[PDB]
Amino acid sequence: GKKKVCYYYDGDIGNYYYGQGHPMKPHRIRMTHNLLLNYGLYRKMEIYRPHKATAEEMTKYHSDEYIKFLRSIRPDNMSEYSKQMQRFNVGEDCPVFDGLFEFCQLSTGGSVAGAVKLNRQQTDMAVNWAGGLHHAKKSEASGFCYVNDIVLAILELLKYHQRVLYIDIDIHHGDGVEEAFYTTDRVMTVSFHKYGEYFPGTGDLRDIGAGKGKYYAVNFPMRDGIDDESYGQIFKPIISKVMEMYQPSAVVLQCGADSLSGDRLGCFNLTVKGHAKCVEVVKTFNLPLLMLGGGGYTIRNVARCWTYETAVALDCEIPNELPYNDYFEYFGPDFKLHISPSNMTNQNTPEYMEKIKQRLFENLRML
Ligand SMILES: CCCC[C@H](NC(=O)[C@H](C)c1c(C)[nH]c2ccc(O)cc12)c1ncc(-c2cc3ccccc3nc2OC)[nH]1
Ligand SMILES: [Ca+2]
Ligand SMILES: [Ca+2]
Ligand SMILES: [Zn+2]
């Protein structure tokens, strides 16, 4: 049936700024919120403002030293932390910016709060578009991510769920999450990503977990230009097999929008409908589900994607004609919700897709 949806958002999230020319733009979270408000999707959800996650909540995963550094570093005192910046990988892809720690607190607060709501059986779905920062490591920032809100949310789900399934459709390998749970069978991580001469350089289909975690990490490496057809020939069959074999009791779905056609950093060719089909597929299993954001660097498309995925979560049909909103000019020249794929070549032949799917199916038989 239709499901209850709780949505997490802080009105200040859009004001955090990574710096001039940096592709990560928290403003896209505010564009998403304003678009979904203007479509009237607020009348259908319970809207919550997440608390600022404490350093203590963050150290359930991250090292005390790394969290202490994040809570301390500021653009005005950076000069005194030259040593720690190198140690914790802060200052290149992951710059020091005003309110960095508060931004991490809000991103994490939404994911953890959503997991608590699911644990209490008070919602069917919890949504936190400011979360999904899957690259952060135990004691290091990485790929525009500082605090791994996903790992923290999964640890919260593990208090009441024996097995948790994590699915990541961001164009980049979900390395921080996979690494956190690499040697456990209590979390199965499934990542679909571009692999080959691309960040973070991990996620080979031969990375399948280790020790008790062997066969509990699944990686589907893809080439440039994947389209809705190709993604659609493999996503439902793999997720169906994972659901059958693993039988998770909760699911976390990272909906990174950098896998869409026309992304500033991505090289895939999915439309918003193609990307949202993943949400439709996962939602049909009727399991407690935490939906998170992630990458997405052509911000008009990120807002379209996450607004449509929120409509999918609510089983609410919304028109293609965009309603007027505070960022209406960003959606020109068409002012439509849905996007068209480009003419880029799909390097993922149908035979390649079937062959990788078959290799993963062999690994899934080992559960
Ligand atoms: C989602 C995160 C993607 C990160 C990614 N980083 C990298 O590609 C770097 C070189 C990298 C590193 C450190 N490790 C790697 C391992 C494998 C690999 O193939 C690459 C890397 C990135 N792609 C765009 C940028 C980028 C960063 C900027 C920072 C400040 C200002 C402007 C920037 N512009 C950028 O692209 C307009 N960075
Ligand atoms: Ca991924
Ligand atoms: Ca695992
Ligand atoms: Zn990404």
Side-chain angles (χ1 to χ4, degrees), residues 134-135 143-144 168 170-173 198-199 254 256-259 263 265 294-297:
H134 62 173
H135 296 306
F144 315 157
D168 186 323
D170 192 277
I171 196 179
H172 304 97
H173 177 228
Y198 202 69
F199 182 90
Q254 200 270 17
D258 46 13
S259 39
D263 188 83
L265 298 189
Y297 305 100

Side-chain angles (χ1 to χ4, degrees), residues 107-173:
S107 167
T108 299
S111 302
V112 176
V116 173
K117 196 77 169 168
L118 290 161
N119 280 349
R120 293 181 172 173
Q121 301 170 223
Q122 286 172 21
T123 194
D124 295 311
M125 285 175 273
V127 181
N128 175 33
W129 298 126
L133 301 188
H134 62 173
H135 296 306
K137 315 291 196 299
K138 181 175 170 173
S139 306
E140 184 197 300
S142 178
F144 315 157
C145 308
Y146 310 78
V147 174
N148 202 312
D149 65 286
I150 308 165
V151 169
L152 292 169
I154 292 171
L155 290 173
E156 179 59 35
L157 293 168
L158 290 165
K159 288 171 183 185
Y160 295 90
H161 297 276
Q162 183 59 214
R163 292 175 309 282
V164 175
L165 171 62
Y166 171 68
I167 304 164
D168 186 323
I169 64 171
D170 192 277
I171 196 179
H172 304 97
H173 177 228

Side-chain angles (χ1 to χ4, degrees), residues 268-330:
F268 281 1
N269 199 20
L270 298 186
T271 67
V272 166
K273 282 177 185 174
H275 195 272
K277 176 79 159 63
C278 298
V279 178
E280 291 164 32
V281 169
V282 177
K283 191 176 133 82
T284 85
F285 291 92
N286 294 316
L287 291 171
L289 172 62
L290 176 56
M291 285 166 63
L292 304 175
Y297 305 100
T298 295
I299 67 180
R300 60 186 180 279
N301 294 338
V302 173
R304 290 170 157 124
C305 194
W306 294 343
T307 291
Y308 188 64
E309 290 172 339
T310 301
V312 165
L314 289 167
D315 270 290
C316 184
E317 290 186 33
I318 59 170
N320 191 36
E321 176 91 344
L322 291 174
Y324 184 65
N325 61 87
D326 291 350
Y327 308 106
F328 195 70
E329 68 282 15
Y330 286 62

Side-chain angles (χ1 to χ4, degrees), residues 178 181-189 209 213 216-217:
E178 177 181 288
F181 303 111
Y182 210 62
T183 66
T184 182
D185 61 355
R186 290 203 57 208
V187 184
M188 178 169 273
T189 61
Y216 294 91

